[PDB]
Amino acid sequence: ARYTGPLTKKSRRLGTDLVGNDKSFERRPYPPGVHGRGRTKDSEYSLQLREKQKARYAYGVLEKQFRRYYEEADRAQGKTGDVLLQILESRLDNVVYRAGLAATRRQARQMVSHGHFLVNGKKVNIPSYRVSTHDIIDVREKSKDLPPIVIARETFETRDVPAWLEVRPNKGRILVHQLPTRDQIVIDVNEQAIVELYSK
Amino acid sequence: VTAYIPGVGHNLQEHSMVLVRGGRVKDLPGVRYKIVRGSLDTQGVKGRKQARSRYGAKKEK
Amino acid sequence: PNIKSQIKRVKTNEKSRQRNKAVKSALRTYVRNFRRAAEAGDVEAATKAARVANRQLDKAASKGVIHKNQAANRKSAISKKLNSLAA
Amino acid sequence: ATKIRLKRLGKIRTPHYRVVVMDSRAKRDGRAIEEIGQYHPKADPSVIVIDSERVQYWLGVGAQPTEAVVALLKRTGDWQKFTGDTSPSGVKPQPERPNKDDLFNAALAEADEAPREAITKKSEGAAA
RNA sequence: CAUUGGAGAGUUUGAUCCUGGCUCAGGACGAACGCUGGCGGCGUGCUUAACACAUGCAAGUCGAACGGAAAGGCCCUUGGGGUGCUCGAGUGGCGAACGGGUGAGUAACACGUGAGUAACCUGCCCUUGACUUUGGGAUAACUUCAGGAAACUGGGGCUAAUACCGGAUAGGAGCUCCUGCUGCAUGGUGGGGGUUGGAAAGUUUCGGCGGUUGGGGAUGGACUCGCGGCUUAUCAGCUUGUUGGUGGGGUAGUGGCUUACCAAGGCUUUGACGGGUAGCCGGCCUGAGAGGGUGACCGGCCACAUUGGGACUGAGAUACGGCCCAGACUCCUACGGGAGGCAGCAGUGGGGAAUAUUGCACAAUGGGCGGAAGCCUGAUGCAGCAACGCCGCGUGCGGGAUGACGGCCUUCGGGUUGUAAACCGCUUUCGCCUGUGACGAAGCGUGAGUGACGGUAAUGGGUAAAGAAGCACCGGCUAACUACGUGCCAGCAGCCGCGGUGAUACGUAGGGUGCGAGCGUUGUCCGGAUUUAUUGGGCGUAAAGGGCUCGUAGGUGGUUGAUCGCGUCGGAAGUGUAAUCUUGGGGCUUAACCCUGAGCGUGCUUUCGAUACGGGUUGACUUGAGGAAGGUAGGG
RNA sequence: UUGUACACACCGCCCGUCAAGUCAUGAAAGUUGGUAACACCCGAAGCCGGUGGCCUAACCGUUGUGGGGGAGCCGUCGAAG
Ligand SMILES: [Mg+2]
Ligand SMILES: [Mg+2]
Ligand SMILES: [Mg+2]
Ligand SMILES: [Mg+2]
Ligand SMILES: [Mg+2]
Ligand SMILES: [Mg+2]
Ligand SMILES: [Mg+2]
Ligand SMILES: [Mg+2]
Ligand SMILES: [Mg+2]
Ligand SMILES: [Mg+2]
Ligand SMILES: [Mg+2]
Ligand SMILES: [Mg+2]
Ligand SMILES: [Mg+2]
Ligand SMILES: [Mg+2]
Ligand SMILES: [Mg+2]
Ligand SMILES: [Mg+2]
Ligand SMILES: [Mg+2]
Ligand SMILES: [Mg+2]
Ligand SMILES: [Mg+2]
Ligand SMILES: [Mg+2]
Ligand SMILES: [Mg+2]
Ligand SMILES: [Mg+2]
Ligand SMILES: [Mg+2]
Ligand SMILES: [Mg+2]
Ligand SMILES: [Mg+2]
Ligand SMILES: [Mg+2]
Ligand SMILES: [Mg+2]
Ligand SMILES: [Mg+2]
Ligand SMILES: [Mg+2]
Ligand SMILES: [Mg+2]
Ligand SMILES: [Mg+2]
Ligand SMILES: [Mg+2]
Ligand SMILES: [Mg+2]
Ligand SMILES: [Mg+2]
Ligand SMILES: [Mg+2]
Ligand SMILES: [Mg+2]
Ligand SMILES: [Mg+2]
Ligand SMILES: [Mg+2]
Ligand SMILES: [Mg+2]
Ligand SMILES: [Mg+2]
Ligand SMILES: [Mg+2]
Ligand SMILES: [Mg+2]
Ligand SMILES: [Mg+2]
Ligand SMILES: [Mg+2]
Ligand SMILES: [Mg+2]
Ligand SMILES: [Mg+2]
């Protein structure tokens, strides 16, 4: 119920950097496997499916839960892709990643599932915990000196925190100013393509 | 009814108890059912390594 | 029966059936006596029989052998017949 | 007889009762003549909401409460208004009150010791 | 004075366009099967044989109604005190008609919805007005006798009641007569008079708890009715208590419900009668919607309890764990005769592709009895079992080029598996080990005490990157390709098709893709299918205009005045339980799930308005239509 | 240029008997079941309607009994056969 295999293979297949940089993605222009350099047809399904899989492997969400997110966004009022990206960003592991306390979303999932975090006073070990507005995520007092935590404390200045979060790095406290908007989620997929895909 | 027996390999014979599922064989007039390999007397195809579940072949170490 | 409550109940049901049957048969006999007096056309005999039958119908209704509505219906029939006889 | 009783609802190991009015012969979780209140005992200082006018009407018309509903009416004070008896009538204590916006504004500004205990944990990694 | 909603593809030809079927991509399930399988949360789990059932349990309770004393318990030289609590068996009261099960029957006022009863009954409960009077005779238990293998049965004697039966006294019960106000026809209701009548029970630990009868309330039931929801005309006639009337009877009650007499009706091509299938619904699935399919859990109504029939008791009966008779079954028998009904819970056999434990507790909620403590509760709360469904989590995280070996491919250059590994540093959710340890109980109990679930959830500590990944697919639709083997063989396939020696379609391998504790297959339903087209199709040649006309029912209607207000439209009130569903808040660490507010409940009834249109009633007009007179053509 | 059902292109396409095999279906002397009823005969339980010479503690007595009830019996209906 969690993808544990290599991520560079998925990034190469999907054609975009799922996470990180300056890595084995120097072989980017071609998917993994023996048949990587051949010319591709890329149907509309192919395109749509690529966008959906890009979002899925970026956020570490499997198909059933991603589908559930899709119906929630579709029911919600407003743009379906905007709401879907808003939900995926409101996931707690992504919140930790965006605040910059984790090197990657996989590391954020690791620490969240291991329970190194407090949500507004209550301990949460659910990576899919949907953080609500005005929430206060806190690092567990016992685990305020994790090696990944201190690496993040050394590196966060380079990292860019989105406008909808406030982070007290050394304190391990992520204040949620508001639930993010499409202009605030970084554009790296085609949510419109995903929405069109979930209609066929 | 007449039932097809899929897969390379066959053991079932006269008065062998079988499980019969739906399924048409297009180039066979009058065959509208197939025999479920790996159930009751009929057994899985011997040398399967791909699509084993559809032929009732247990996984090999 | 399989329940001792139910065995007790069949015994008491038989007892109540005897009681109710006796009372109903007495009611029927009294009403028949009034009807035969009315057919004979007597006035005093029919009046006395009607009084007796109505009193017994009310007594049975009080005892619960018959419903008060049934007692009222039969009393009404008897009284109307007696009035027709008098007229 | 008409009863004022509790109709069980909710999950396994999580009961929420509806103080309802129905006759004795009816099944426990069935059609009710009227729904009067709710009773959540699983929650802290159990929640007890009873419609005073309706419960007074049903008591005055002759509905018989179950012992649980008698306890709830004692706590709501209805069991004293009807069948006047000397009982404490301990109207439910509230199950306290949290808040979110005030805490967020308190911490947004908290700053100071936020990043301050934060550089203290910097000294901690030093100690780490 | 805007919308929350609609995707196609393949295949007829040498090629094309159209028509058109077939097939597929989606969703779903009370599913089964194959391979595989870690955990948790919440649900669900005989759809077939309404098949036959071993065993335990599922309905009892009351000594504050009664005689009592067979047990325990106190007091006494072992019996004895019924003496006090207590208490088998027995009378008596109440309950047993609820709860629980199943869906066989039923095409029907069974159900949904809305009304009517001036045709109704209603124990316990609440309320209010009267009362609770005077007598008497038995009987179970017990005792004795006789009979029976048993089940048990019949005598003799004996005994108590809130058991049973006389009487008195009591309206709004019968009959009848005045009179007030009135409805919807039968009528309803207020007041007075005459006449004939109808009850009861006592008990206590003195704190209680009960009895009878009027009138209201609440509750539950009953009947009647308008409207609504299957198929079949290769079923056209059906009915004789049948349709109506009058008198009687009956019933809680109206009624051919029943009866006697009289009449000859009643239903039906707008489908009676017959056949087929089926419990109905709130809902569920699907769908843009309209619809289509469906009636598991949960909730409402109905029906049924071995098959058929019947009543009895009761406030109330298809009387599941009642009775009687018959049939079919099973069992006991001493052969004379007896006993029984899991579609209650668990369970067995059987059938089947297929569906669980002969579990714990009355702690919570609900129910029965008791004044109460309390007793009973296979309702229910729980646990066990199964990936059956939904949801959540894990099987690691960061770094790591020297792009290592090894597989596989190759153009022998290399490429690929692949940051994958090795290696380095981390983290400890779940699992395993160990500690702490609940809520549910503002209950209950005079108190003492009191949680089945349960050492459970939750949580601290410890272990090791470890105990934890499979399944399908890769010609097109359709995301993903090569090598080797095979050689129209073996085989594949949902359709098009593939295999005849270079197979991206068979088999294996490497690589890849989609999903993931699941993944596929089969079955079934809806979608796509506008492929029954009301929304939303057509009929010259593609399937489709009757051979033609007349004409019945039916459908439909030129201009206009007046009026009705049935359709139609707009308010109001009532109803549409709950759950579900949509949505706003809240709780479970999140989610599923749960609670709560609102909406929805697409209707129906009542009532008040509007009168443009449809229709009804009614009156005009002549242009449609027909007629008169004259003219007139023709193988009618 | 005209016609066409040919496009493997007239050495094309294509129709029906007969012969062989396979599958589904119709008829058929008959044969074997099932369901739903009908008309009669008989008719248990039971309710109802009669009757009751037998049996009867409460009621009344002119205290020899009577009233009323019950067993039994008959009749209608009536499942099954
Ligand atoms: Mg007699
Ligand atoms: Mg009468
Ligand atoms: Mg053609
Ligand atoms: Mg072709
Ligand atoms: Mg006893
Ligand atoms: Mg029921
Ligand atoms: Mg049902
Ligand atoms: Mg009495
Ligand atoms: Mg109808
Ligand atoms: Mg009549
Ligand atoms: Mg049926
Ligand atoms: Mg239906
Ligand atoms: Mg049900
Ligand atoms: Mg009765
Ligand atoms: Mg019973
Ligand atoms: Mg019952
Ligand atoms: Mg039974
Ligand atoms: Mg069972
Ligand atoms: Mg079997
Ligand atoms: Mg209780
Ligand atoms: Mg108590
Ligand atoms: Mg018991
Ligand atoms: Mg492709
Ligand atoms: Mg080859
Ligand atoms: Mg359609
Ligand atoms: Mg279809
Ligand atoms: Mg068409
Ligand atoms: Mg036309
Ligand atoms: Mg044609
Ligand atoms: Mg024509
Ligand atoms: Mg013709
Ligand atoms: Mg006409
Ligand atoms: Mg007109
Ligand atoms: Mg007009
Ligand atoms: Mg709700
Ligand atoms: Mg929440
Ligand atoms: Mg509702
Ligand atoms: Mg008109
Ligand atoms: Mg002329
Ligand atoms: Mg051709
Ligand atoms: Mg034939
Ligand atoms: Mg006869
Ligand atoms: Mg008789
Ligand atoms: Mg006599
Ligand atoms: Mg007879
Ligand atoms: Mg018969």
JSON list of N, CA and C (backbone and C1' of nucleotides) in Angstrom, two decimals, chain B residues 4 7-8 22 26-27 36 48-54 58-59, chain E residues 33-36 471-473 491-493 496 507-509 522:
[
{"chain": "B", "resi": 4, "resn": "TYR", "atom": "N", "xyz": [-14.66, -26.18, -23.37]},
{"chain": "B", "resi": 4, "resn": "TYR", "atom": "CA", "xyz": [-13.28, -26.13, -23.82]},
{"chain": "B", "resi": 4, "resn": "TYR", "atom": "C", "xyz": [-12.34, -26.36, -22.64]},
{"chain": "B", "resi": 7, "resn": "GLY", "atom": "N", "xyz": [-5.24, -24.33, -22.20]},
{"chain": "B", "resi": 7, "resn": "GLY", "atom": "CA", "xyz": [-3.87, -24.54, -21.75]},
{"chain": "B", "resi": 7, "resn": "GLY", "atom": "C", "xyz": [-3.24, -25.77, -22.37]},
{"chain": "B", "resi": 8, "resn": "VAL", "atom": "N", "xyz": [-1.92, -25.74, -22.49]},
{"chain": "B", "resi": 8, "resn": "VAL", "atom": "CA", "xyz": [-1.16, -26.85, -23.04]},
{"chain": "B", "resi": 8, "resn": "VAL", "atom": "C", "xyz": [-0.97, -27.88, -21.93]},
{"chain": "B", "resi": 22, "resn": "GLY", "atom": "N", "xyz": [-18.41, -19.77, -17.60]},
{"chain": "B", "resi": 22, "resn": "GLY", "atom": "CA", "xyz": [-18.76, -19.21, -18.88]},
{"chain": "B", "resi": 22, "resn": "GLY", "atom": "C", "xyz": [-17.53, -18.91, -19.71]},
{"chain": "B", "resi": 26, "resn": "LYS", "atom": "N", "xyz": [-14.58, -18.76, -30.06]},
{"chain": "B", "resi": 26, "resn": "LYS", "atom": "CA", "xyz": [-15.18, -18.20, -31.26]},
{"chain": "B", "resi": 26, "resn": "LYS", "atom": "C", "xyz": [-15.11, -19.17, -32.44]},
{"chain": "B", "resi": 27, "resn": "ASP", "atom": "N", "xyz": [-13.96, -19.81, -32.64]},
{"chain": "B", "resi": 27, "resn": "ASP", "atom": "CA", "xyz": [-13.81, -20.74, -33.75]},
{"chain": "B", "resi": 27, "resn": "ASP", "atom": "C", "xyz": [-14.18, -22.16, -33.34]},
{"chain": "B", "resi": 36, "resn": "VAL", "atom": "N", "xyz": [-12.57, -24.74, -15.60]},
{"chain": "B", "resi": 36, "resn": "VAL", "atom": "CA", "xyz": [-11.69, -23.97, -14.73]},
{"chain": "B", "resi": 36, "resn": "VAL", "atom": "C", "xyz": [-10.52, -24.86, -14.32]},
{"chain": "B", "resi": 48, "resn": "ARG", "atom": "N", "xyz": [3.43, -23.50, -16.67]},
{"chain": "B", "resi": 48, "resn": "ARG", "atom": "CA", "xyz": [3.07, -22.09, -16.70]},
{"chain": "B", "resi": 48, "resn": "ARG", "atom": "C", "xyz": [3.99, -21.27, -15.82]},
{"chain": "B", "resi": 49, "resn": "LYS", "atom": "N", "xyz": [4.37, -20.10, -16.32]},
{"chain": "B", "resi": 49, "resn": "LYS", "atom": "CA", "xyz": [5.08, -19.11, -15.53]},
{"chain": "B", "resi": 49, "resn": "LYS", "atom": "C", "xyz": [4.51, -17.72, -15.70]},
{"chain": "B", "resi": 50, "resn": "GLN", "atom": "N", "xyz": [3.59, -17.52, -16.64]},
{"chain": "B", "resi": 50, "resn": "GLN", "atom": "CA", "xyz": [2.93, -16.24, -16.86]},
{"chain": "B", "resi": 50, "resn": "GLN", "atom": "C", "xyz": [1.44, -16.49, -16.99]},
{"chain": "B", "resi": 51, "resn": "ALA", "atom": "N", "xyz": [0.64, -15.58, -16.42]},
{"chain": "B", "resi": 51, "resn": "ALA", "atom": "CA", "xyz": [-0.81, -15.75, -16.34]},
{"chain": "B", "resi": 51, "resn": "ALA", "atom": "C", "xyz": [-1.16, -17.07, -15.65]},
{"chain": "B", "resi": 52, "resn": "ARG", "atom": "N", "xyz": [-0.45, -17.36, -14.56]},
{"chain": "B", "resi": 52, "resn": "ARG", "atom": "CA", "xyz": [-0.64, -18.64, -13.87]},
{"chain": "B", "resi": 52, "resn": "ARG", "atom": "C", "xyz": [-2.04, -18.75, -13.28]},
{"chain": "B", "resi": 53, "resn": "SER", "atom": "N", "xyz": [-2.56, -17.66, -12.71]},
{"chain": "B", "resi": 53, "resn": "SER", "atom": "CA", "xyz": [-3.85, -17.73, -12.03]},
{"chain": "B", "resi": 53, "resn": "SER", "atom": "C", "xyz": [-4.97, -18.13, -12.98]},
{"chain": "B", "resi": 54, "resn": "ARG", "atom": "N", "xyz": [-4.87, -17.74, -14.25]},
{"chain": "B", "resi": 54, "resn": "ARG", "atom": "CA", "xyz": [-5.90, -18.10, -15.21]},
{"chain": "B", "resi": 54, "resn": "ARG", "atom": "C", "xyz": [-5.83, -19.56, -15.62]},
{"chain": "B", "resi": 58, "resn": "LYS", "atom": "N", "xyz": [0.08, -23.11, -9.32]},
{"chain": "B", "resi": 58, "resn": "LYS", "atom": "CA", "xyz": [0.62, -22.56, -8.09]},
{"chain": "B", "resi": 58, "resn": "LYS", "atom": "C", "xyz": [1.99, -21.95, -8.33]},
{"chain": "B", "resi": 59, "resn": "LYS", "atom": "N", "xyz": [2.31, -20.92, -7.56]},
{"chain": "B", "resi": 59, "resn": "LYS", "atom": "CA", "xyz": [3.59, -20.25, -7.71]},
{"chain": "B", "resi": 59, "resn": "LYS", "atom": "C", "xyz": [4.72, -21.18, -7.30]},
{"chain": "E", "resi": 33, "resn": "C", "atom": "P", "xyz": [-15.31, -20.28, -3.96]},
{"chain": "E", "resi": 33, "resn": "C", "atom": "O5'", "xyz": [-14.47, -20.39, -5.30]},
{"chain": "E", "resi": 33, "resn": "C", "atom": "C5'", "xyz": [-14.74, -21.41, -6.25]},
{"chain": "E", "resi": 33, "resn": "C", "atom": "C4'", "xyz": [-14.01, -21.16, -7.54]},
{"chain": "E", "resi": 33, "resn": "C", "atom": "C3'", "xyz": [-12.52, -20.96, -7.42]},
{"chain": "E", "resi": 33, "resn": "C", "atom": "O3'", "xyz": [-11.81, -22.18, -7.34]},
{"chain": "E", "resi": 33, "resn": "C", "atom": "C1'", "xyz": [-13.42, -19.25, -8.76]},
{"chain": "E", "resi": 34, "resn": "G", "atom": "P", "xyz": [-10.48, -22.28, -6.45]},
{"chain": "E", "resi": 34, "resn": "G", "atom": "O5'", "xyz": [-9.36, -21.62, -7.37]},
{"chain": "E", "resi": 34, "resn": "G", "atom": "C5'", "xyz": [-9.12, -22.11, -8.67]},
{"chain": "E", "resi": 34, "resn": "G", "atom": "C4'", "xyz": [-8.13, -21.25, -9.40]},
{"chain": "E", "resi": 34, "resn": "G", "atom": "C3'", "xyz": [-6.94, -20.78, -8.59]},
{"chain": "E", "resi": 34, "resn": "G", "atom": "O3'", "xyz": [-5.93, -21.77, -8.50]},
{"chain": "E", "resi": 34, "resn": "G", "atom": "C1'", "xyz": [-7.85, -18.96, -9.77]},
{"chain": "E", "resi": 35, "resn": "C", "atom": "P", "xyz": [-5.06, -21.91, -7.16]},
{"chain": "E", "resi": 35, "resn": "C", "atom": "O5'", "xyz": [-4.06, -20.68, -7.22]},
{"chain": "E", "resi": 35, "resn": "C", "atom": "C5'", "xyz": [-3.07, -20.61, -8.22]},
{"chain": "E", "resi": 35, "resn": "C", "atom": "C4'", "xyz": [-2.42, -19.26, -8.27]},
{"chain": "E", "resi": 35, "resn": "C", "atom": "C3'", "xyz": [-1.86, -18.73, -6.96]},
{"chain": "E", "resi": 35, "resn": "C", "atom": "O3'", "xyz": [-0.60, -19.29, -6.62]},
{"chain": "E", "resi": 35, "resn": "C", "atom": "C1'", "xyz": [-3.09, -17.03, -8.02]},
{"chain": "E", "resi": 36, "resn": "U", "atom": "P", "xyz": [-0.22, -19.51, -5.08]},
{"chain": "E", "resi": 36, "resn": "U", "atom": "O5'", "xyz": [-0.25, -18.05, -4.46]},
{"chain": "E", "resi": 36, "resn": "U", "atom": "C5'", "xyz": [0.74, -17.10, -4.81]},
{"chain": "E", "resi": 36, "resn": "U", "atom": "C4'", "xyz": [0.40, -15.73, -4.28]},
{"chain": "E", "resi": 36, "resn": "U", "atom": "C3'", "xyz": [0.28, -15.59, -2.78]},
{"chain": "E", "resi": 36, "resn": "U", "atom": "O3'", "xyz": [1.53, -15.54, -2.12]},
{"chain": "E", "resi": 36, "resn": "U", "atom": "C1'", "xyz": [-1.52, -14.47, -3.80]},
{"chain": "E", "resi": 471, "resn": "C", "atom": "P", "xyz": [1.90, -13.97, -8.00]},
{"chain": "E", "resi": 471, "resn": "C", "atom": "O5'", "xyz": [0.73, -13.16, -8.71]},
{"chain": "E", "resi": 471, "resn": "C", "atom": "C5'", "xyz": [-0.62, -13.50, -8.48]},
{"chain": "E", "resi": 471, "resn": "C", "atom": "C4'", "xyz": [-1.56, -12.52, -9.14]},
{"chain": "E", "resi": 471, "resn": "C", "atom": "C3'", "xyz": [-1.40, -12.36, -10.64]},
{"chain": "E", "resi": 471, "resn": "C", "atom": "O3'", "xyz": [-2.03, -13.39, -11.38]},
{"chain": "E", "resi": 471, "resn": "C", "atom": "C1'", "xyz": [-1.54, -10.24, -9.64]},
{"chain": "E", "resi": 472, "resn": "A", "atom": "P", "xyz": [-1.50, -13.76, -12.84]},
{"chain": "E", "resi": 472, "resn": "A", "atom": "O5'", "xyz": [-2.04, -12.59, -13.77]},
{"chain": "E", "resi": 472, "resn": "A", "atom": "C5'", "xyz": [-3.43, -12.46, -14.02]},
{"chain": "E", "resi": 472, "resn": "A", "atom": "C4'", "xyz": [-3.75, -11.11, -14.61]},
{"chain": "E", "resi": 472, "resn": "A", "atom": "C3'", "xyz": [-3.07, -10.79, -15.93]},
{"chain": "E", "resi": 472, "resn": "A", "atom": "O3'", "xyz": [-3.71, -11.37, -17.05]},
{"chain": "E", "resi": 472, "resn": "A", "atom": "C1'", "xyz": [-2.81, -8.97, -14.47]},
{"chain": "E", "resi": 473, "resn": "C", "atom": "P", "xyz": [-2.84, -11.92, -18.27]},
{"chain": "E", "resi": 473, "resn": "C", "atom": "O5'", "xyz": [-2.49, -10.62, -19.13]},
{"chain": "E", "resi": 473, "resn": "C", "atom": "C5'", "xyz": [-3.51, -9.74, -19.57]},
{"chain": "E", "resi": 473, "resn": "C", "atom": "C4'", "xyz": [-2.97, -8.35, -19.79]},
{"chain": "E", "resi": 473, "resn": "C", "atom": "C3'", "xyz": [-1.89, -8.22, -20.85]},
{"chain": "E", "resi": 473, "resn": "C", "atom": "O3'", "xyz": [-2.43, -8.12, -22.15]},
{"chain": "E", "resi": 473, "resn": "C", "atom": "C1'", "xyz": [-1.21, -7.09, -18.89]},
{"chain": "E", "resi": 491, "resn": "G", "atom": "P", "xyz": [-2.68, -28.26, -26.91]},
{"chain": "E", "resi": 491, "resn": "G", "atom": "O5'", "xyz": [-2.75, -26.80, -26.30]},
{"chain": "E", "resi": 491, "resn": "G", "atom": "C5'", "xyz": [-3.53, -25.78, -26.91]},
{"chain": "E", "resi": 491, "resn": "G", "atom": "C4'", "xyz": [-2.78, -24.47, -26.95]},
{"chain": "E", "resi": 491, "resn": "G", "atom": "C3'", "xyz": [-3.61, -23.21, -26.86]},
{"chain": "E", "resi": 491, "resn": "G", "atom": "O3'", "xyz": [-4.04, -22.89, -25.55]},
{"chain": "E", "resi": 491, "resn": "G", "atom": "C1'", "xyz": [-2.07, -22.98, -28.61]},
{"chain": "E", "resi": 492, "resn": "C", "atom": "P", "xyz": [-5.44, -22.14, -25.34]},
{"chain": "E", "resi": 492, "resn": "C", "atom": "O5'", "xyz": [-5.17, -20.65, -25.84]},
{"chain": "E", "resi": 492, "resn": "C", "atom": "C5'", "xyz": [-4.19, -19.84, -25.21]},
{"chain": "E", "resi": 492, "resn": "C", "atom": "C4'", "xyz": [-4.07, -18.50, -25.88]},
{"chain": "E", "resi": 492, "resn": "C", "atom": "C3'", "xyz": [-5.34, -17.66, -25.92]},
{"chain": "E", "resi": 492, "resn": "C", "atom": "O3'", "xyz": [-5.58, -16.98, -24.70]},
{"chain": "E", "resi": 492, "resn": "C", "atom": "C1'", "xyz": [-4.33, -17.66, -28.05]},
{"chain": "E", "resi": 493, "resn": "A", "atom": "P", "xyz": [-7.06, -16.93, -24.10]},
{"chain": "E", "resi": 493, "resn": "A", "atom": "O5'", "xyz": [-7.84, -15.95, -25.08]},
{"chain": "E", "resi": 493, "resn": "A", "atom": "C5'", "xyz": [-7.51, -14.57, -25.14]},
{"chain": "E", "resi": 493, "resn": "A", "atom": "C4'", "xyz": [-8.24, -13.89, -26.26]},
{"chain": "E", "resi": 493, "resn": "A", "atom": "C3'", "xyz": [-9.74, -14.13, -26.30]},
{"chain": "E", "resi": 493, "resn": "A", "atom": "O3'", "xyz": [-10.46, -13.29, -25.42]},
{"chain": "E", "resi": 493, "resn": "A", "atom": "C1'", "xyz": [-8.85, -14.55, -28.43]},
{"chain": "E", "resi": 496, "resn": "C", "atom": "P", "xyz": [-14.73, -11.13, -35.06]},
{"chain": "E", "resi": 496, "resn": "C", "atom": "O5'", "xyz": [-13.60, -10.16, -35.61]},
{"chain": "E", "resi": 496, "resn": "C", "atom": "C5'", "xyz": [-13.94, -9.03, -36.39]},
{"chain": "E", "resi": 496, "resn": "C", "atom": "C4'", "xyz": [-12.74, -8.15, -36.65]},
{"chain": "E", "resi": 496, "resn": "C", "atom": "C3'", "xyz": [-11.55, -8.81, -37.30]},
{"chain": "E", "resi": 496, "resn": "C", "atom": "O3'", "xyz": [-11.70, -8.97, -38.70]},
{"chain": "E", "resi": 496, "resn": "C", "atom": "C1'", "xyz": [-10.82, -7.50, -35.49]},
{"chain": "E", "resi": 507, "resn": "G", "atom": "P", "xyz": [0.46, -18.55, -24.13]},
{"chain": "E", "resi": 507, "resn": "G", "atom": "O5'", "xyz": [1.84, -19.30, -23.92]},
{"chain": "E", "resi": 507, "resn": "G", "atom": "C5'", "xyz": [1.88, -20.68, -23.63]},
{"chain": "E", "resi": 507, "resn": "G", "atom": "C4'", "xyz": [3.29, -21.16, -23.47]},
{"chain": "E", "resi": 507, "resn": "G", "atom": "C3'", "xyz": [4.20, -20.28, -22.63]},
{"chain": "E", "resi": 507, "resn": "G", "atom": "O3'", "xyz": [4.06, -20.49, -21.24]},
{"chain": "E", "resi": 507, "resn": "G", "atom": "C1'", "xyz": [5.29, -20.80, -24.65]},
{"chain": "E", "resi": 508, "resn": "U", "atom": "P", "xyz": [4.35, -19.30, -20.21]},
{"chain": "E", "resi": 508, "resn": "U", "atom": "O5'", "xyz": [5.93, -19.15, -20.22]},
{"chain": "E", "resi": 508, "resn": "U", "atom": "C5'", "xyz": [6.76, -20.13, -19.62]},
{"chain": "E", "resi": 508, "resn": "U", "atom": "C4'", "xyz": [8.21, -19.94, -19.99]},
{"chain": "E", "resi": 508, "resn": "U", "atom": "C3'", "xyz": [8.86, -18.65, -19.51]},
{"chain": "E", "resi": 508, "resn": "U", "atom": "O3'", "xyz": [9.26, -18.69, -18.16]},
{"chain": "E", "resi": 508, "resn": "U", "atom": "C1'", "xyz": [9.40, -19.01, -21.78]},
{"chain": "E", "resi": 509, "resn": "A", "atom": "P", "xyz": [9.33, -17.33, -17.30]},
{"chain": "E", "resi": 509, "resn": "A", "atom": "O5'", "xyz": [10.60, -16.57, -17.88]},
{"chain": "E", "resi": 509, "resn": "A", "atom": "C5'", "xyz": [11.91, -17.07, -17.69]},
{"chain": "E", "resi": 509, "resn": "A", "atom": "C4'", "xyz": [12.93, -16.27, -18.46]},
{"chain": "E", "resi": 509, "resn": "A", "atom": "C3'", "xyz": [12.99, -14.79, -18.14]},
{"chain": "E", "resi": 509, "resn": "A", "atom": "O3'", "xyz": [13.76, -14.51, -16.99]},
{"chain": "E", "resi": 509, "resn": "A", "atom": "C1'", "xyz": [12.93, -15.09, -20.48]},
{"chain": "E", "resi": 522, "resn": "U", "atom": "P", "xyz": [-14.10, -13.58, -18.47]},
{"chain": "E", "resi": 522, "resn": "U", "atom": "O5'", "xyz": [-15.24, -14.37, -17.70]},
{"chain": "E", "resi": 522, "resn": "U", "atom": "C5'", "xyz": [-15.35, -15.78, -17.82]},
{"chain": "E", "resi": 522, "resn": "U", "atom": "C4'", "xyz": [-16.29, -16.35, -16.80]},
{"chain": "E", "resi": 522, "resn": "U", "atom": "C3'", "xyz": [-17.66, -15.72, -16.72]},
{"chain": "E", "resi": 522, "resn": "U", "atom": "O3'", "xyz": [-18.53, -16.15, -17.75]},
{"chain": "E", "resi": 522, "resn": "U", "atom": "C1'", "xyz": [-16.81, -16.01, -14.54]}
]
